[PDB]
Symmetry: C3
Subunit: 348 residues, 3 copies
């Protein structure tokens, strides 16, 4: 085969992407999503327990009573909140300092840094090489371990990546410290609720093949889109649906493509195709006059414009549909959801 | 998709009942059952290990505090007595670490213990197995009451039959008369053929499966009184608002919804 | 309840083999393989941590007992001797936190090391993928042996074909004569197309599948002798009741049974 090398690399990357246990849940299976979530939760709690019980001595000598006593007691209010806020702020500052030192050593012309920085850089390079072939606590382990958050609620390329990560961590830490300082005055007196919403619907009588996603943005409240898939016929249908201000006669309304007529037009388009089994058309006709089944909602952390771009890229890209739209139907749905969520990055 | 309140809230509650990975496995697929059983086992044993870990840690901390007081005052009686009280309390708390908790386990066995729990057998036709299957439900502590519930999901076909046998007099002899599994299955297939919404290839597999005994795929025992199971079988074969949710959707969802409805009657929605 | 008790015992043995959720993943869906591997890893980690908890709690119990005895005596060295022995044992056992010996090499593989094991690639046709699919099993430490095993579970056909390349002389020149995997695939598809049990729309998909390379769904490897794989493939092909038990049922369970029979030949069936 003289056309199966770059596609082979892309396919291998796709298979690695789809191999994770708790990533890319099956859109048309609530049980699979529940299984993935429960498995992730179990491993998360087990890892926190292991890292809590692991040291318990150097942690005790560094910041022992401050976090352990509060966690054991909470497992009055103003004092506990102040102590927890101070401990969280000092943890974030310490992480900032150590990653900043690592970054400054990374852009320190490593053939010139001192012995300790050379040792640390070599250790991180060994970590990267081990991960490439395949007592660790990045900083989130402590915060998720002692239930702090729960009760509060060329080598220069890797150098640049680590610098960007350190800058992001510093910004998050500064925001958290400002929030805790504000919370202290209240007692003395991660995005949420703005993420895009994806609802997964499926036509009743042949939902294994035909389904669609309805996506509604937030903090705009007038932009949405419809993305419909039929896998027996290999048909993908996109349309943006919004709401403008339209005056009919002497009255105002929001003249935009309604979801209902969107779904009806998609069904009509899927009916007129020669590859129908002379009964698939019958199923689509029967399902044309009934409300589609709601099959749950998925939420993530990505801008709505990014989702629009990803959907439009899926629609008019040939090799992307050569990759994600060939295979078993379960793999089909998983690859479609992954491509929608991550875009073209799913292949390399 | 214009439906104000009703269908929306029923489908929401149904998804929330089916949104958990611990309960209601797909009966047709023993792999999902194994995954769910292992997941249950890991949750329970890790909660046991967590409570034992916490109680041993707290008793060790109490002992170390007593030791440190002894060390720092050697060169605490009111503390020693409170320490002994705490140690006795912690030993009592940590005694049930060997998983000897049967009261919570038997709390659901108020009237239905083991060897009295009703059995459910899952059967499937040999060829279009993913779409057609049925349950043979047998009761214990009676050995005389049983029923048949058959679903052909592609065509939207549901059949219920009552296989209860009873004493009968035949001349100068006696017998146990009543419907039996073989003729129930054969009549169900016979009724499935004459439906108008066949596929002229689905019918071929059905008629070929009419001459072969069904395939046994396991048994399930759930904490539902067999009288209640019969009641749910009556509701599922009679009512239509319940069916309009349970019998519409992807096949894996449809089968899980059917198992859930058989388990909880009409409690999955509302 | 059906026809025979030998068939039911064989089926029960097969269902118990497939009952576990940590073994015999679905060969076509890599998500299932990932889930099963992660569950197995979590289970082994929990096993090791339970062992470590037992170790640490017994060490702490001995240390606390020695400390309490010393504290009671303090309120010569003869009494402190057991405490010193406990301290020595605790230090020795704490410094022995290693489970990394080469016994784990036979504790997990027990048959063959790395780079001396066959690998099974899995492909499926692009369009009707969930039914037609094949395994390309290529071995190691024989630079010329491999084989092909293809399945079409819609019309229930199994095909096997060796792809071994023997040295051959043609004219006054030499070649490594075997079968091309592409030629094997096209002959398998041609066999599937000309089957009388055609849907007349399934054939237009096999025919479309002929002129495009198949999709690579992944590669896996199990520690079994390659000759055993050859024997198991001809066992799958040339047995009647093995086909009747493994190649009948739900598609998911069918594929799991196929992988299981590749794993164990007929010992899985009993």
């Amino acid at each position: 085969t003289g056309e199966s090398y770059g596609e082979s690399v892309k396919q291998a990357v796709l298979l690695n992407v789809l191999g994770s246990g708790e990533e890319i849940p099956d859109p048309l299976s609530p049980g699979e999503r529940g299984i993935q979530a429960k498995l992730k939760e179990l491993e998360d709690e087990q890892r926190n327990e292991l890292v809590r019980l692991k040291y318990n001595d150097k942690i005790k000598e560094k910041f022992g009573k401050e976090l352990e006593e509060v966690y054991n007691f909470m497992n009055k209010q103003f004092d506990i909140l102040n102590k927890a806020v101070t401990s969280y702020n000092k943890i974030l500052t310490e992480e900032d300092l150590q990653m900043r030192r690592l970054a400054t050593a990374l852009q320190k012309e490593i053939g010139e840094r001192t012995h300790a920085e050379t040792v640390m850089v070599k250790e991180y390079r060994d970590k990267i090489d081990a991960l490439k072939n395949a007592a660790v606590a990045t900083g989130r382990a402590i915060e998720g371990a002692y239930k702090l958050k729960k009760v509060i609620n060329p080598d220069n390329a890797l150098a640049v990546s680590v610098l960007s990560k350190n800058r992001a961590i510093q910004e998050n830490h500064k925001e958290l410290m400002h929030i805790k300082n504000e919370i202290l005055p209240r007692f003395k007196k991660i995005p949420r609720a703005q993420q895009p919403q994806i609802h997964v619907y499926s036509a009743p009588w042949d939902s294994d093949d035909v389904f669609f996603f309805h996506c509604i943005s937030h903090h705009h409240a007038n932009e949405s889109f419809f993305l419909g898939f039929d896998l027996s016929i290999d048909l993908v249908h996109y349309e943006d649906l919004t709401a403008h201000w339209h005056a009919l006669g002497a009255a105002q309304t929001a003249a935009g493509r309604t979801l209902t007529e969107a779904y009806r037009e998609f069904l009509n388009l899927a009916i007129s195709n020669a590859f129908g089994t002379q009964m698939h058309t019958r199923r689509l006709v029967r399902s044309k006059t009934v409300h589609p089944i709601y099959l749950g909602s998925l939420h993530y952390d990505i801008s709505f414009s990014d989702l629009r771009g990803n959907a439009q890229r899926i629609v008019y890209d040939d090799e992307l549909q050569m990759h994600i739209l060939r295979g078993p139907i379960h793999f089909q749905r998983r690859a479609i959801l992954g491509a929608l969520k991550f875009g073209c990055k799913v292949l390399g």
